[PDB]
Symmetry: C2
Subunit: 296 residues, 2 copies
């Protein structure tokens, strides 16, 4: 049951850059996002409102959100790891925020020292204010296809966390294969359990290509009815738990497949590539997009 | 559903090496092949008995075929473009040969001035001589998911050429996405037509990753029932009718996906990665395998 249209959620400026060695100037970030708007993306994760102490690449969050062109119809969600960060996002003009959890206790104890139920106490406070402030919230679940610490993750657990997020108010939850270890059957089992508890349209998948399974895992999710998928431009954002291995699924390669499938994205591939090439040069790296390599 | 087991046809030493910039000595080729046999591959395309004047990277075809270890139960098919090559292969001990055509008239004309019909006349003689000699013949249909000159290729046309190879005597035919422009719908349509005319067991798929669609296209074929797929060790072998992008699908990334699916391949991933790293250093190139890059 392939969807007729898919909403590609671009994470290059946030997830992509957050996971890059060399940092980039604020003006380069704004230009990247503007170019992405130019290419037609309907949603571009813009930045993260979190201390520069924890993640310095996102330190310019306030001015980035303020300086980017706000194209009609385009969404620019931002990450808000804690009540204060959310507080700052609203002030900076954010119309949508993003909270992130995980289906793994260990991974939670490493990423935020707290427990899983505890991280939900934190999230409840944000969703609450978010609801008063009239701010839509998107959830994110890490280790949905496996954890670097705990290893195998259960479809029931992923379904449980996704369920929690959805009932607290999240309008859409993105399931992420952070270490990119998932294969098709794993994806199908996970999505299948989740789909019992949470309606299909509120689901999204974020697959890493560390082991070259991102597009394949994405295809499987699409065949299961999922209509929103996350990706980063030139495949930006490597993996912390791997060597010099690739990171996110390259958005250009994803649009290529979707267009091949005759599936609507609304993205202009030629402009998408310009954006990809613009940032790779600024970063002084090589695009991870195959489409980009075969194209020029 | 999916097959319980897949026969991986390794083409690195043949299709891969031929399409690689630098060349490696005869002993290196022999060692690479021995390393693949040790890794568990059941079929390893070994070399091509073609004029050295035309494809010099395969010039050592006789000594290479004679010098590799012949592991029990393992097949070492070699390419024989014409009758002279076939006769040279037989005289050198070949037990299986491979012939190649295309589902594209323009592609055939620019690579042999003969139409698709005429190309089959040249194969007719080889097939007769092969039957008389008790030698197996695998067929290969390039540009099955598109052609660099004609563009889109009709499913029915691919079905027609494949049926021709089969009725002519080929026990198996590999359908190759020569330029890697394919997407799952295209793969599904082509296979659907081919299957009306040829039994499932006689089919194989060979997807290039020039556009990042190799594994996804391969997955679609597995979902259609195909149980044999061609791949190259470290994604060796670029694409001529393309740019500096990659070529073949990395066997390691294929095995990784198949293991995750719980599909038997009888291949030892760790030993396959050793083979990859070995030929890569001999070629002074970085592996195209994602599994390899993230495993070390």
């Amino acid at each position: 049951t392939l969807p007729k249209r898919v909403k590609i959620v671009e994470v290059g400026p946030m997830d992509g850059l957050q996971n890059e060695k060399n940092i980039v100037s604020t003006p380069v970030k704004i230009k990247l996002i503007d170019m992405l708007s130019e290419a037609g993306l309907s949603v571009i994760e813009t930045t993260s409102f979190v201390s520069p102490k924890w993640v310095p690449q996102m330190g310019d969050h306030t001015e980035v959100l303020k300086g980017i062109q706000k194209f009609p119809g385009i969404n620019y969600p931002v990450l808000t790891p804690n009540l204060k960060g959310f507080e700052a996002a609203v002030a900076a003009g954010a119309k949508e925020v993003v909270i992130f959890g995980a289906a793994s206790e260990l991974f939670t104890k490493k990423n935020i020292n707290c427990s899983i139920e505890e991280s939900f106490q934190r999230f409840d406070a944000i969703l609450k204010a978010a609801q008063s402030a009239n701010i839509s919230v998107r959830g994110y679940v890490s280790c949905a296809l496996g954890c670097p610490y705990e290893g195998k993750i259960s479809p029931a657990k992923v379904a449980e966390v996704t369920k929690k997020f959805y009932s607290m108010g999240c309008y859409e939850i993105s399931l992420g294969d952070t270490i990119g270890v998932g294969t098709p059957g794993i994806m199908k089992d996970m999505l299948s359990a989740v789909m019992q508890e949470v309606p299909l349209a509120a689901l999204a998948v974020h697959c890493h290509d560390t082991y070259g399974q991102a597009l394949a895992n994405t295809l499987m999710a699409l065949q299961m009815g999922v209509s929103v998928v996350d990706s980063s431009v030139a495949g930006l954002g490597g993996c912390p738990y791997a060597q010099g291995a690739s990171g996110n699924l390259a958005t250009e390669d994803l649009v290529y497949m979707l267009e091949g499938l005759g599936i609507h994205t609304g993205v202009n591939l030629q402009k998408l590539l310009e954006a990809g090439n613009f940032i790779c040069q600024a970063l002084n790296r090589k695009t991870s997009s195959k489409v980009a390599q075969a194209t020029c």
